[PDB]
Amino acid sequence: LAFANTLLLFSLHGQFRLDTGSTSVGTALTPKTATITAITTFDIVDAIDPIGVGRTVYFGIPKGDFSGLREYFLPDASGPIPLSEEVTSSVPRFVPGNLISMSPSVSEEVITMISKDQPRRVYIYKFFFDDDQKLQSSWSYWEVAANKTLLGGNVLDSDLYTCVEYSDGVYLEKTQLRPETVDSGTEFEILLDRKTTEAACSTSLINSGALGVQTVITLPYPMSGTGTMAVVGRFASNNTIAHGQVIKATAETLTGGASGNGTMTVPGDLSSAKFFVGEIYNMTYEFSTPYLKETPPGGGLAVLANPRLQLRTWSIVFDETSNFSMKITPGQRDELTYPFNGYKIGSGQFPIGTPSLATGRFRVPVMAQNIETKIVLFSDSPLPCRVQSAEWEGWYQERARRL
Amino acid sequence: KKLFAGSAGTGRPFTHIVDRDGVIRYLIFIQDNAIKVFDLDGNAQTVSTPNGTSYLNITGEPSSTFRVASIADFTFIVNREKTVAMDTTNKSYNWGTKSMVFIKSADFSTTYRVKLNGTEKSVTTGNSSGSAPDTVTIASDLATQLNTISGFTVTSTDYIIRITKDDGGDYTLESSDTKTADATSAIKGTVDSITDLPTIAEHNFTVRIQGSATTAFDDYFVKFEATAGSGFGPGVWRETVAPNIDHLLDKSTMPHTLVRNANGTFTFAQFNYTGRVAGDTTTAPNPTFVGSKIKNINLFRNRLVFLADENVILSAADSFERFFPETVQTLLDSDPIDISSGGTSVNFLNSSLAFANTLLLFSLHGQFRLDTGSTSVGTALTPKTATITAITTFDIVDAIDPIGVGRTVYFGIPKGDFSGLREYFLPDASGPIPLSEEVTSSVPRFVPGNLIS
Amino acid sequence: RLVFLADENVILSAADSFERFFPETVQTLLDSDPIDISSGGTSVNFLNSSLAFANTLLLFSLHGQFRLDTGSTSVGTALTPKTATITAITTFDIVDAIDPI
């Protein structure tokens, strides 16, 4: 790799550099001056190449069956030994083995990993820098429907280009990683997989001129009948279907249209409406056990474990969200749900017929003990949802005094 | 004040301002085949165009197509779309199908043989008992002997026999005497060493010297010019360019200049570049910008800097109009430099900046610096020392030119339809990797795309 | 040596001979011959004032600052025609009425 002011070379058990060696970076390279010198003795995997992101280098390290990611930072060419740090120490069993794709994104600070033992998942690592210190370093992974098979991924500018395989061919999909992305002409984005506009699909209608017509839609690509599709009105005016209205099929055929394309049937006449079409994917966020932290005498933070702490109410703070749900399960009892959809009856901020994006707070009771709860933030609508923070109130009982 | 009536055209005009000495200032206005100049009070200054403005014809945006660089008495203008090309019509000198026979000395009882086109004519001199032989008489006899050959023109003067073929075709030449084969020299095409050159010759005569790769010098050529200035006469042999080879640059495509005079009027005319002066096509290859668009221009360390493709081309030392090597026998540190930028990804250089203690070079996906590399900032720039090294892998927008404010460097980055701004701080040249930061992270949809100023 | 300022060029006299400004011989360049450099840059920079401070020679223009040096960590390296140069540093602003101190 050509980076910093040197030519780094990597072996299976060590890292070396090639240089004339002088503080003179552009010294003449001659047969009596070209040498190789060791630097450190870390590890590396040969499946994928190390990459250079920003000012730091990244590469993957082996951890047996599962693989880990280690970055290390190189100061000045004539300067000290480079600094190194492992960022997967807290997740020893997360990233599978046999990696096949690793792509960076400098402007959006995202590193994307695709494995082979899991052909339906994309692993996302998010980092954030300030001068030298590190503020954010998080892990998570996306998912697709139950019939696709990822092959490999690349990144250009700030978009991820993927080459997936369906039951009949290999397609190309484009994904936008930029923040605050918005659909053209409107205020918020509509979330659907395989999202292709109406202009790419042709329609026909059955039993025209009568009440209760149905429209037969011919998608450009063959269906994957295991998943569930939907039709959503797109454009913000002068349309038969209201903005953000969702319609579900009544009779879907996996294939049988022209050229083997899939077909769908919906009520009403949509021969001149504007709408999207695609699949639906779920999001899940499971909170952890809430505890308390206080500064010990030596400095730092310690987590209290002994005192009784019974959670009472759980609240979250959202902004510009339409719909989501909360799923709370106490210890060995029935699961409870608490949905929310933004339409506050009585308030006239959202008239009938327009999508709702609210701003406020929500509160539900949990009624259990901190060590025997599971809190899940669940949402499946094709409308946006984003959450800022949360706050809980509980009963704190101490059976003695604290030193 | 109002500048001029009418509109400025569909494209956005390209504007620059020059501050010379604090009392002289003027605006530069270039758009759509036209170029105009104003002062800070809106009083237009006349501009003369001796060669026309065909160089300024354009199809894209002038703001993102034109680029300027000012030095002393000139202000270079660069068209980022024109494809430069070597001139092929007004070629260099021709060889000429002429040759001479040189007679060095004479000795008693020696027969000279001259072979021309496979036939041999012989002249025999007298022994010691006869008169002293002389090169003049021997050459006269030989010349009148070969003059009988049809299709060839044979003439003699002094000790030189001049041979020329009427149809201009080639022929063989070889002569030898019967003692040592040294007193005769068949000067034809190329010869062994310059030591065999006769004292007198014709001006503009071209001969080739076979160099010795054992000494790590390739071939070269030598040309003649009479001391009298014309005709035949003594003169000098100097290292010259090989004949019958294109050696001129088409000035009608290469960057032009804008000059101000002492009376206030300006002039927009071509620049007088020089062409290949020594060597041949292989030993003095065409500079890498030939056959490809020129991207930007800058001045650094009393040399002219051109950017083209992945290569950076530097002019000769203290001579801004020379781009071909001066001599081909040995390297000189005043010769132009040709450099390619390393990397596993394709990088087309767009903009350059002189700042900190280095010359930064920007690509579409990375950053580079050109330097001797030493902590010795002012080390000599030589062909074995100029280099390009990577620094980082950030992003760059090509519409505008990155600028330098105070001690920091600023440029714009692409955020999709909207555009952002990123600045990065460079400590000492020999020190660590420069620190970088983004300042538009809180406003991802604020600045519109297609920046122009 | 003697230093003059004119246009964009810095002029250095012959070594240890303040009254000589032309090259002594034309056959081979000697290190005692006068030196002339141009301040490179994409903007016109007429030099006005100079100052000898720290371990360098600071030259100021109307819109920037430059330094003349061999550039080496070797402060007392010989000044030769093959080595002299001008390198920019920053781009602050200067008034020409008075000399920086």
A-chain residues within 8 Å CB-CB of B374? 22-27
d(C-alpha B357, C-alpha B377), whole Å:
7
Q: B386: number of CA atoms within 13 Å, CB side?
A: 21
B-chain residues within 8 Å CB-CB of C31? none
C-chain residues within 8 Å CB-CB of B407? 90
CA triple A1-B351-B380, angle to 5 deg: 75
Cβ separation of B413 and A107 shorter than 8 Å?
yes
> What amino acid is encoded at B179 in this protein?
K
Shortest Cα–Cα distance, A31 to chain B (Å): 14
Shortest Cα–Cα distance, A128 to chain B (Å): 11
Residue B85 Cα distances to A164, B292, B319, angstroms? 46, 8, 22
E-strand spans in B72-172? Answer: 74-79, 98-103, 111-116, 119-124, 152-157, 160-165
For B272, other C-beta atoms within 10 Å of its C-beta total 8
d(C-alpha A331, C-alpha A372), whole Å:
5
For A115, other C-beta atoms within 10 Å of its C-beta total 20
Which residue bears the tokens 């902004």? A319
Cβ separation of C87 and B357 shorter than 8 Å?
yes
Residue of B204, B202, B203, B175 lying closest to B188 (CA atoms): B175
d(C-alpha B27, C-alpha B36), whole Å:
9
Element (H, E) at C4: strand C3-6
3-state secondary structure chain A: CEECCEEEEEECCEEEEEECCCCCCCCCCCCCCCEEEEEECCCCCCCCCCEEECCEEEEEEEECCEEEEEEEECCCCCCCCCEEEECCCCCCCCECCCCCEEECCCCCCEEEEECCCCCCCCEEEEEEEECCEEEEEEEEECCCCCCCCEEEEEEECCEEEEEEECCCCEEEEEEECCCCCCCCCCCCCCCCECCCCHHHCEEEEECCCCCCCEEEEECCCCCCCCCCEEEEECCCCCCCCCCCCEECCCCCECCCCHHHCCEEEEECCCCCCCEEEEECCCEEEECCCCCEEECCCCCCCEEECCCEEEEEEEEEEEEEECCEEEEEECCCCCCEECCECCCCCCCCCCCCCCCCCEEEEEEEECCCCCCCCEEEEEECCCCCCCEEEEEEEEEEECCCCCC
d(C-alpha B79, C-alpha B65), whole Å:
6
The conformational region for residue A50 under phi > 0 = left, psi -120 to 50 = alpha, else beta, is beta
Residue of A37, A42, A79, A82 lying closest to A59 (CA atoms): A42
Last residue before each gap in chain C (C to N over 2.5 A)? none
Which member of B375, B379, B435 has the closest CB to residue A131?
B435
- Reduced DSSP (H G I as helix, E B as strand, rest coil) percent helix, strand, coil of chain B, to 5: 5, 40, 55
Cβ separation of A24 and B372 shorter than 8 Å?
yes
Q: For residue B61, what are its two tokens?
A: 């945006």
Which residue bears the tokens 């709408």? A275
Residue B234 phi, psi dihedral angles, 5° rounding = -55, 155
d(C-alpha A339, C-alpha A286), whole Å:
16
Cβ separation of A106 and B393 shorter than 8 Å?
yes
Q: Is residue B65 classed as helix, strand or coil in its secondary structure?
A: helix
Chains in contact with C via at least 3 Cβ–Cβ pairs below 8 Å: B
d(C-alpha B372, C-alpha B379), whole Å:
6
Residues on A contacting B at a C-beta cutoff of 8 Å:
1-5, 22-28, 52-55, 74-76, 78-79, 106-107, 131, 157-158, 176, 178-182
Cβ separation of B445 and A182 shorter than 8 Å?
yes
Sheet strand arrangement including A263-267: A202-206, A214-218, A263-267
The experimental resolution of this structure, in angstroms, equals 3.8
B142-147 long-range contacts, CB within 8 A, separation 24+: B142/B101, B142/B103, B142/B112, B142/B114, B143/B101, B145/B114, B145/B121, B146/B114, B146/B116, B146/B121
Element (H, E) at B420: strand B418-425
d(C-alpha A35, C-alpha A8), whole Å:
13
For A46, other C-beta atoms within 10 Å of its C-beta total 9
Which member of B21, B22, B70 has the closest CB to residue C43?
B70
Chains in contact with A via at least 3 Cβ–Cβ pairs below 8 Å: B
